[PDB]
Amino acid sequence: GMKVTFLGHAVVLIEGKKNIIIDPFISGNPVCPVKLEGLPKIDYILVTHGHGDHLGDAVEIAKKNDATVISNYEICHYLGKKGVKTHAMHIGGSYLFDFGRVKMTPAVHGSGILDGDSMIYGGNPSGFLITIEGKKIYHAGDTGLTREMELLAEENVDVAFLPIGGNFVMDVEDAVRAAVMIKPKKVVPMHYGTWELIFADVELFKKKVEEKGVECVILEPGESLEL
Template identity: 30%
Template structure:
């Protein structure tokens, strides 16, 4: 009876922390939704933060980041208040050039510039920068082509896609063999749930997390996003998680 109680308590803690576990052929990946477009990944002894935002409190209970990925210059992606509140002295940053130019005062072990269509590696994890931008491509774009990065992470036998702030661009639609995708959907900054679901149905990740879904009109209807996806393709697992305390 005691063992049953202990297992149950561990299960409750796992869910309260919002942690998902993905099995690979070489250990587990732990996924921690934090807030908006911010998440943390743990793999073996490594901890990865993506777009740290919302204050250090959201990372409570996690190890300091070994690797930090930043997608763009906007404050919900490059957030100096959060970065200076975290211990990043030993963190390796991978960022686009536009972000690197704005990182004065951020402690780090190294800032590595990675622009679209280039790859690097960190501790055996392959990192590829992929395009993220608004359509049409013009001078008025909030997210011009080439400034920011989406990312592909190859961890063991899994490929993880992090969209960054983008619309349903051809480069997204052309993705292949994606195991886990984090896809944005907030108007007027990125794309509608219709655009997002149409793109997801085209590149067919095994698991998709809608995130970054708070826009000017409030929260995007992620339940509808899930319904649209699964009414066409039941094999895509849509994971709805609590990215906002007010949601």
């Protein structure tokens, strides 16, 4: 099987036959319970978009672990110049890796890479649909509500990670609509509570989304579930 750990914000660690981390915003993440040294051996890094609180410590983690970063073409070009190993994809594209299948999904957001003083173009933002041993995980990344999420309903997602913080992403209300579009077996709220600007009523989300027949698992940073 596999162990899926939420480490705060948009961060998600997947431990199976290979170890995969999504949007590794670790150092500088005020709600992340672990340091970089607290992570296990990392094989793959998934980056949804270029923003600092998602790209995060991908360069350091990749180099330390000899890990491969999976992201869009533009983000992978940026990382390639830093001496990071990459497997470039793009939106709606999928590839079968040794551990399983990764598919980039559409998102409505931005993908600017802040490099010192300059905003570098990091392609278009995404989510990830990950298929491991028949099980399906959806990490929406940063996104607003979008009708492209309806395309995921036929996938029969087991666990969906959705942002609920609002302002930069979907709020509670729109996240509930997203859950109804996607119809995952379980939903985990994320990308909230990190700062005051993205405070969200997570208990209200659980209540509202479970009224729509979708099980909601509120994971505190550090907590995990099994698939």
